[PDB]
Design a protein around this ligand. Structure first.
Ligand SMILES: Nc1ncnc2c1ncn2[C@@H]1O[C@H](COP(=O)(O)OP(=O)(O)O)[C@@H](O)[C@H]1O
Ligand SMILES: [Ca+2]
Ligand SMILES: [Ca+2]
Ligand SMILES: [Ca+2]
Ligand SMILES: [Ca+2]
Ligand SMILES: [Ca+2]
Ligand SMILES: [Ca+2]
Length: 369
């Protein structure tokens, strides 16, 4: 036992690295691609499968799969390929030398955590492992053990209330909208101005425009009203062919979808309503602690303006005397991984790891509680 590994299994991105590093060394797409024809398989190099950017480059030829599409792992043969890629191709480690901490989505079934554990020990021969809930790790990365996390990533968004380290399962809310939807919606709305962003390459360009220029308006209708005379709304962006496009109200219309899912044709409540609905499914006596500790996590919470908008919307739904605080750490794109890194580097607590001997002696029930 020397250096622990942290693997945050994201719906769109795997974040992995060594405990104790400040950020993950390896970040790649959680996609597996498989040829559909034997001749194509052999002609492209005899590889049975491709993972990450290699898989994405071969789209249209390979069948792509997202084995963690909405945060829960649904295909174990594909997941084994992602973990093999993580260990051998990205981190370049021998997994049998490292205790490995894995993350899991809110509401992950016990049988799913058991299958994750079985693969780590039987397939990769890790010496020890541990599974932690992603939102709890993000709460720890913010330095608290009580609070409600809003975690918006690539394929899913959750609201997870947590009391003294315990996620309250009956109050967890899941919204199947997150960054991949926002990138698709920005491609569509830019195509409204006479531009054309439709190819794989164009989606990557639009993902860059989203991450660099979008923001959350404090009020959508008033921001639209200010747009005509604003001297700072319009931004220019140079494309790869040297053309320059102008982006204006699309900067805030795109992320407005998190608060108004009807923009992409979803009937769901927006993230401020799900936050409130989650707090109201908790014991009345812990709500004050949740309202004062709303922690944002995940890549899709990176927009400038999001904390102020969430403060405004939550204030409008909560009792008038309620103290409301939104915490949006600067490193929140990686706060799940960072929480895992903090936890896995606490060698004083090395007995919390599940070792291979313990698993062999106790069975699959050992990874829970
Ligand atoms: N600065 C940013 N602004 C807006 N979205 C961002 C930013 N940085 C990353 N994202 C988006 O966040 C998503 C990835 O977030 P992440 O928390 O890693 O997701 P997951 O864990 O579900 O894979 C992608 O959709 C990405 O485009
Ligand atoms: Ca995630
Ligand atoms: Ca990468
Ligand atoms: Ca084109
Ligand atoms: Ca309004
Ligand atoms: Ca619909
Ligand atoms: Ca132990």
């Amino acid at each position: 036992e020397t250096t622990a590994l942290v693997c945050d299994n994201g719906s769109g991105l795997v974040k992995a690295g060594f405990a104790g590093d400040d950020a993950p060394r390896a970040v790649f797409p959680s996609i597996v691609g498989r040829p559909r024809h034997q001749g194509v398989m052999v002609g492209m190099g005899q590889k049975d499968s491709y993972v990450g950017d290699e898989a994405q480059s071969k789209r249209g030829i390979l069948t792509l799969k997202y084995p963690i599409e909405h945060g829960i792992i649904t295909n174990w043969d594909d997941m084994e390929k992602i973990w093999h890629h993580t260990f051998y191709n990205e981190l370049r480690v021998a997994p049998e030398e490292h205790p490995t901490l894995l993350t899991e989505a809110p509401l992950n079934p016990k049988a799913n955590r058991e299958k994750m554990t079985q693969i780590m020990f039987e397939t990769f021969n890790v010496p020890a492992m541990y599974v932690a809930i992603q939102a709890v790790l993000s709460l720890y990365a913010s330095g608290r053990t009580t609070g409600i996390v809003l975690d918006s990533g690539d394929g899913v968004t959750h609201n997870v209330p947590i009391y003294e380290g315990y996620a309250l399962p009956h109050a967890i809310m899941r919204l199947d909208l997150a960054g991949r939807d926002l990138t698709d919606y920005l491609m569509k709305i830019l195509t409204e101005r006479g531009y054309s962003f439709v190819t794989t390459a164009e989606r990557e360009i639009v993902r860059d425009i989203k991450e660099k220029l979008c923001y959350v308006a404090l009020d959508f209708e008033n921001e639209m009203a200010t747009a005509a005379s604003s001297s700072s709304l319009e931004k220019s962006y140079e494309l790869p062919d040297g053309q320059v496009i102008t982006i204006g109200n699309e900067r805030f219309r795109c992320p407005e979808t998190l608060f108004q899912p009807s923009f992409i044709g979803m009937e769901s409540a927006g993230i401020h309503e799900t936050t409130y609905n989650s707090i109201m499914k908790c014991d009345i006596d812990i709500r004050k602690d949740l309202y004062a500790n709303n922690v944002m996590s995940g890549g899709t919470t990176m927009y400038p303006g999001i904390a102020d908008r969430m403060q405004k919307e939550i204030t409008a739904l909560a009792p008038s005397t309620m103290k409301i605080k939104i915490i949006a750490p600067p490193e929140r794109k990686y706060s799940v991984w960072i929480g895992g890194s903090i936890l896995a580097s606490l060698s004083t607590f090395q007995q919390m790891w599940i070792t291979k001997q313990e698993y062999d002696e106790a069975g699959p029930s050992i990874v829970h509680r």
